[PDB]
Amino acid sequence: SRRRYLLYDVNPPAGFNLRRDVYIRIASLLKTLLKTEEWVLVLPPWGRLYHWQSPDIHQVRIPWSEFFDLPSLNKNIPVIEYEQFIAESGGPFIDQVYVLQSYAEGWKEGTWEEKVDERPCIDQLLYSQDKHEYYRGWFWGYEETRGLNVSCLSVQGSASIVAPLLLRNTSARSVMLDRAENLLHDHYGGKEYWDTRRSMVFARHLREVGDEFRSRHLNSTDDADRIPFQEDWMKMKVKLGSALGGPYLGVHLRRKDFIWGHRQDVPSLEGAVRKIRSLMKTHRLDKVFVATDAVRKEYEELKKLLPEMVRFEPTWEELELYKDGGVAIIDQWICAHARFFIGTSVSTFSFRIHEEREILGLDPKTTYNRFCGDQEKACEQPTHWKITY
Numbered sequence: 001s002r003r004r005y006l007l008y009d010v011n012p013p014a015g016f017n018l019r020r021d022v023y024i025r026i027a028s029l030l031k032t033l034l035k036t037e038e039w040v041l042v043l044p045p046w047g048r049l050y051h052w053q054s055p056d057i058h059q060v061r062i063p064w065s066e067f068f069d070l071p072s073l074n075k076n077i078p079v080i081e082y083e084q085f086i087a088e089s090g091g092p093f094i095d096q097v098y099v100l101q102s103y104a105e106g107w108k109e110g111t112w113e114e115k116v117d118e119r120p121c122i123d124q125l126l127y128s129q130d131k132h133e134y135y136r137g138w139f140w141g142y143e144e145t146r147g148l149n150v151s152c153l154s155v156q157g158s159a160s161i162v163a164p165l166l167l168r169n170t171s172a173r174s175v176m177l178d179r180a181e182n183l184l185h186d187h188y189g190g191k192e193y194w195d196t197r198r199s200m201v202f203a204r205h206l207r208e209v210g211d212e213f214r215s216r217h218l219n220s221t222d223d224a225d226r227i228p229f230q231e232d233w234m235k236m237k238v239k240l241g242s243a244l245g246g247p248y249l250g251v252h253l254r255r256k257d258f259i260w261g262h263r264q265d266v267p268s269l270e271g272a273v274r275k276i277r278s279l280m281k282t283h284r285l286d287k288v289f290v291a292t293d294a295v296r297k298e299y300e301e302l303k304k305l306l307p308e309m310v311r312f313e314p315t316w317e318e319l320e321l322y323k324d325g326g327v328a329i330i331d332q333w334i335c336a337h338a339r340f341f342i343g344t345s346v347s348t349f350s351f352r353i354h355e356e357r358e359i360l361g362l363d364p365k366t367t368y369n370r371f372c373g374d375q376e377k378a379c380e381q382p383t384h385w386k387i388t389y
């Protein structure tokens, strides 16, 4: 009716945890759009073109309902699930699809300017026309989706750089931004940002599972970890470093990249196990929870070196249920609540955890921490980004 719809997709290789960063980026834009007209973000169904990236078992068209808490998300910006977008608008039709791309001419130095232009497609377009002239595409796996018009947009700055073009230069009821990761954060550590990031609260069902785990195998519960909780994410502001954590060390070992001949910033199993023990003994920690994507061969090895290790291993049913990002989220949630945490270099999984601990109020010194390559000389820890309420 009175309102315009915003949709987006990201490059196919993008991970679950990155797609989450991009959502914040789009939020940033929408907010800016809402200052002028009536808009609503349409949540892109989870599940991915390269379906062999995820084990799952071929899981697709998953609604955000399964991962986050929608009412929570909505307190930040007006947001709706895709299946409902089809409900509201007549069919699964999109008026305009813009594919985002860099600038053909690239840039010399000095040439940095925020800007966006209609441009010829740098890369071969993936949308094909049907016998009816509609544009068929991947469309988050929704096979019947048809788009009305497709163009490319060269683009440079933050996400909101796009807003005017959408407001003035187009009439479309619904607009989709493909290759959205091309867009940058408006102002990253910003207060606008943190609003969005805090808005994404895990699906209740998921946290309950992690809380189950913490209570059972970790001797950890919210009260004993000195972390008061509040359902309304807005009503929860926390003096920094008040939250204690569970009597356990949280660790996230990101290993499936390693088939790379060499990477300076990831540790050997022995080398990492040494850090673990050093940490356990230092902070007087009893148990250690591990979130890891490791191969069975490597996990068996870890379990040898670290019998005291605890891991969350989902049953088939459990995974078919919570999907990949569901288990992913559980794994994160648990790490977030550990008294002290160490993650893997430049792993956007670990990044999300940093963000969670920073929301719970855990002292930063126990948050931003990373395993070092056995021989890597300059080993720079992750940057502390403080919440702004």
Ligand SMILES: C[C@@H]1O[C@H](OP(=O)(O)OP(=O)(O)OC[C@H]2O[C@@H](n3cnc4c(=O)[nH]c(N)nc43)[C@H](O)[C@@H]2O)[C@@H](O)[C@H](O)[C@@H]1O
Residues within 6 Å of the ligand: 013, 014, 015, 016, 017, 018, 252, 253, 254, 257, 291, 292, 293, 324, 325, 327, 328, 329, 331, 346, 347, 348, 349, 350
């Ligand atoms: C190298 C590139 O890195 C890019 O992200 P990259 O920084 O790895 O960082 P992540 O986004 O963590 O990539 C690992 C992905 O696999 C799953 N994953 C990784 N670690 C864990 C874990 O400990 N537990 C669970 N449940 N799941 C895990 C999760 O879905 C996560 O998004 C990727 O998007 C590209 O596909 C590519 O792989």
Ligand SMILES: *[C@@H]1O[C@H](CO)[C@@H](O)[C@H](O)[C@H]1NC(C)=O
Residues within 6 Å of the ligand: 117, 118, 165, 168, 169
């Ligand atoms: C959009 O409209 C404005 C104002 O009418 C015009 O000046 C500008 O050239 C248009 N921009 C694009 C990218 O078409």
Ligand SMILES: [Cl-]
Residues within 6 Å of the ligand: 014, 015, 016, 019, 046, 047, 048
């Ligand atoms: Cl995904």
